Design a protein around this nucleic acid. Structure first.
Lengths: 704, 105
DNA sequence: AAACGACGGCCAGTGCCAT
DNA sequence: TGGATGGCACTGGCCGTCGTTT
């Protein structure tokens, strides 16, 4: 096992030159440095470890270092370099698996001062340097400040343009932090048994003797990094065309709304409290005011004529008068994007808000707006125009105007490369961003069809044939309820699992909770299973907490296994708990549940523990599943990539969207995904049968 | 003695009209505005025949205020013959209000 | 030196969009 | 006496920072 880190001239996207690289080997126990002209030897050093069946440790290597060495080795040395996944370890991945709750563990580090504020809860190499006490400095700082003591200025991200010995040493600094970080992680006996020395074993023993989560998170990271590079083919012309239609509609709506509501003045700037004129008491419900410290009617003297009383001085042009308070105001034009302006105009028209926010302001969301009623017919009809407007803005903001709009991320290759943290959420779910491809409006929401159709394999033309690709959309059928069925099989011996199979599980929950409609039941189970209070539950059938408590107690009496399961979870985790000023104060026996692959899954709250358990199982089942699917596809001969047969484009919790060169391959992808899901189910002795459903089509709108 | 107003009659009441007019731009939701109303009651009585007071509610008549550029309230505008002779912003005291009127007439 | 003031970078408060 | 987990777009109050006016 060796430990390494490199330095290049840019982000993966535009990296062209390899600067330096350090390799700490555990056998020899000594470092070795590589400079620009040593890149050839550096790559050889890595291949040797692979020849020995060893391991290579990189911090953030799956996403950067390895693919960067693949790209740099081609354009610089014109050589084929491909580090086999099974030989690579990624501290950033282990870090995210073992310390999935850095946010809390850090509060103590924030207060003490051993960890800078900006690095709060960061898994970055530097952040770990401060946690381990290995940080003697940061390169970008020994450069920026050292740039002053040299004259020249600084350009956002330029400390990496050219190689310099100062870089070659901070490069070493980064290898010792990696090594120290690795040993800190290998010392966690829950993931790495003591009976084995992991800094001294073969890759086959490293994966088989460590907790299974270690292997899964590494395969998931390798595959997801790959998916980010494939990217999602995106139809720019369609989205730009949509932006025009929406902007024109936004303008027409703005015009009509500024005609209904006009302009008006409103307090802006006041700092002190207006005091009652006669009594002097502070009056809080009046806008704040400004009390000028200067100003008058006549400019103070300075001439011997007025230095006693005689020749007139000079009147004051100033508008204020020291002493007299005024309410500063601004003139504002109605802005339909302002919840504040909406609530101001409607209240003026006779609307009396019912629900408020903790900060006092009246709630103005889609729900309440839908129910607002005022006597001014014009004012009333305008509410639907405000609703449309807000929705229009949401779409425009996501597709074109926002900092992170899709139009701002399309690459030259006509694809959106969304990044994904495979292990970003506590439950183990992945998180998506830059942009969040896991949040594109559904085909069921306004303008959702058009938005979805813009993301599709059809927008990628094959590099050989020129023909558009095809899309395969696969989802894991009812994954959450099936996971719940696996966990209660312990108390009901597969009774509920069989209910799923027979079909119509929602009808069964309806009968047990005694709800009037099948839809009330679907909306009940998820609300109930995840913590909903008695009120929200009652509101399903048009009632309150009263109907709520009876709705849940009925459900639990009819579904004993669920009650047993919750009680079981409650007693393993909580010692005692109490309510104080609205918040629940808990005392834990243990703050974590074990996951399907052995990892510790941190629990935030008791009412949400069951959701933690199910979201976690669904997340790990899906992680293993998309891993196994790609493994079976590659094993059947299909090649992964655009220059190949299929390309992973997006993984959104329980679903994947796969680009396929031909319909025939789409069909194989779909069948394979189902074979892999059954494999996963047998692999973990799952007590409920798992399934998937696939759809072929040109884009995301059709494949769902 | 105090004259009300409207975006309409404003023209044919403040602009034309010979003599001096002190116009108050107020708003029902302003503290300073409501406290200087009393002082204006007295002044509207004292200075009769030498100037007439006129109040304008910026909420009911949104058209006129923008024209002069209100930046705070209450705002006292001094209209001579038909022009803006002088303006003062704030809740002046009875004694301060006087000095202002005794320096622009 | 004291602030009037128009300007501007943050950041918390709200809400919406997905699973 | 609780839907949960996340990413993000907007509005608008709350300070530093400059330049400016008595």
């Amino acid at each position: 096992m060796i430990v390494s880190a490199i330095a290049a001239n840019a982000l993966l996207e535009s990296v062209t030159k390899f600067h330096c690289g350090v390799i700490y080997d555990y056998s020899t126990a000594e470092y070795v440095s590589y400079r620009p002209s040593d890149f050839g030897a550096y790559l050889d050093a890595l291949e040797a470890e692979v020849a020995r069946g060893g391991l290579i440790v990189f911090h953030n290597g799956h996403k950067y270092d390895v693919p960067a060495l693949t790209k740099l080795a081609k354009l610089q040395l014109n050589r084929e370099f491909h580090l086999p996944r099974e030989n690579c370890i990624d501290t950033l991945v282990l870090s995210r698996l073992i310390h999935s709750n850095l946010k809390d563990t850090d509060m103590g580090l924030l207060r003490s001062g051993k960890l800078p504020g900006k690095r709060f809860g960061s898994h970055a190499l530097e952040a770990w340097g401060y946690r381990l006490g290995e940080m003697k400095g940061e390169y970008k700082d020994d450069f920026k400040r050292m740039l002053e003591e040299q004259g020249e200025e600084y350009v956002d991200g330029m400390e990496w343009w050219n190689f310099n010995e100062e870089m070659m040493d901070y490069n070493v600094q980064d290898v010792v932090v990696t090594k120290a970080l690795l040993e800190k992680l290998l010392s966690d006996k829950h993931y790495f048994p003591p009976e084995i020395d992991f800094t001294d074993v073969g890759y086959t023993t490293f994966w088989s003797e460590s907790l299974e989560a270690v292997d899964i998170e590494h395969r998931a990271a390798w595959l997801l990094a790959k998916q980010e590079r494939n990217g999602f083919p995106f139809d720019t012309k369609a989205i730009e065309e949509l932006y025009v239609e929406l902007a024109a509609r936004r303008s027409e709506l703005l015009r009509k709304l500024t005609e209904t509501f006009g302009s008006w003045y409103q307090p802006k700037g006041g700092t002190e409290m207006f005091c009652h004129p006669r009594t002097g008491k502070p009056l809080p419900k009046y806008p704040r005011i400004k009390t000028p410290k200067v100003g008058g009617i006549f400019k103070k003297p300075k001439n011997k004529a007025q230095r006693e009383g005689r020749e007139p001085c000079e009147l004051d042009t100033r508008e204020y008068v020291a002493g007299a308070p005024y309410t500063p105001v601004e003139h504002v034009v109605f802005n339909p994007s302002s919840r504040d302006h909406i609530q101001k105009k409607l209240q003026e028209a006779g609307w009396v808000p019912t629900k408020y926010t903790d900060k006092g302001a009246p709630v103005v969301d889609d729900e309440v707006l839908e129910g607002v009623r005022v006597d001014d017919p014009e004012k009333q009809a305008a509410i639907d125009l405000i609703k449309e407007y807000l929705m229009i803005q949401k779409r425009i903001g996501q597709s074109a105007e926002g900092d992170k709009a899709w139009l701002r991320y399309v690459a030259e290759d006509g694809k959106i490369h969304g990044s994904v943290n495979p292990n970003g959420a506590v439950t183990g779910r992945a998180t998506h961003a830059f942009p969040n491809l896991a949040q594109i409006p559904g085909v069921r929401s306004p303008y959702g069809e058009q938005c979805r159709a813009a993301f599709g394999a059809e927008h990628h033309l094959d590099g050989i044939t020129g023909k558009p690709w095809v899309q395969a959309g696969i989802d894991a059928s009812g994954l959450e309820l099936r996971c719940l069925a696996h966990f209660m099989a312990r108390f009901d011996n597969g009774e509920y699992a069989h209910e799923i199979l027979n079909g119509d599980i929602h009808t069964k929950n309806q009968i047990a909770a005694e709800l009037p409609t099948r839809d009330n039941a679907k909306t009940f189970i998820y609300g109930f299973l995840y913590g909903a209070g008695d009120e929200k539950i009652g509101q399903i059938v048009g009632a309150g907490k009263e109907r709520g408590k009876e709705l849940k107690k009925k459900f639990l009496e009819n579904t004993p296994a669920i009650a047993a399961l919750r009680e079981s979870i409650q007693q393993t985790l909580v010692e005692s708990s109490q309510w104080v000023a609205g918040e629940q104060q808990v005392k834990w026996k243990r703050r974590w549940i074990k996951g399907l692959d052995g990892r510790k899954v941190h629990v935030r709250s008791p009412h949400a523990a069951l959701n933690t358990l199910l979201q976690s199982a669904g997340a790990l089942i899906c992680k293993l599943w998309i891993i196994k699917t790609e493994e079976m596809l590659v094993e059947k001969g299909l090649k992964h990539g655009w220059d190949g047969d299929f390309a992973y484009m997006a993984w959104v919790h329980d679903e994947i969207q796969v680009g396929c060169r031909t319909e025939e391959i789409a069909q194989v992808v779909i069948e394979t995904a189902q074979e892999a899901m059954r494999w996963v189910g047998d692999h973990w002795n799952f007590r409920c049968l798992l399934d998937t459903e696939g759809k072929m089509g040109p884009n995301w709108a059709i494949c769902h | 003695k105090i004259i009300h107003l409207t975006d309409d009659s404003f023209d044919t009441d403040v602009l034309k009209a010979d003599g001096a007019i002190l116009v108050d731009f107020w708003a029902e939701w302003c503290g300073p505005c409501k406290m200087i109303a009393p002082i204006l009651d007295e002044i509207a009585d004292e200075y009769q025949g030498k100037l007439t007071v006129a109040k304008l509610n910026i909420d009911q008549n949104p058209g006129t205020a923008p024209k002069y550029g209100i930046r705070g309230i209450p705002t006292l505008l001094l209209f001579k013959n038909g022009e803006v002779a002088a303006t003062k912003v704030g809740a002046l005291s009875k004694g301060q209000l006087k000095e202002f009127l005794d320096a622009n007439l």
